[PDB]
């Protein structure tokens, strides 16, 4: 039972579909990465930040 | 073992609701209108299990 319950989180994003970005020409045009993209990235856990706020 | 471990995480990333067969990497299980892979970014190449001679 230890580290089974509430031990992991996945947080999604709008990056694939589209967003405005703080880059010249992208501030008012919705653009996304495309259907082909990198899927996941591990947030580093050595200081336990995810237990204060994920 | 590696291709199934990859495939199970591809199913997760394409958010599939498909029930696993007894062997998920047998192509005979993927059709008709079963796996519905037509929109996917990534897939595993299926193969017959009795021919796999890897250690």
Automatic annotation (TrEMBL), chain A:
Highest rank taxon of the organism: Viruses
UniProt-recorded name of the protein: Minor tail protein
Natural source organism: Mycobacterium phage Bxb1
Lineage: Viruses, Duplodnaviria, Heunggongvirae, Uroviricota, Caudoviricetes
Residues of the full protein shown: 438 to 491 of 600
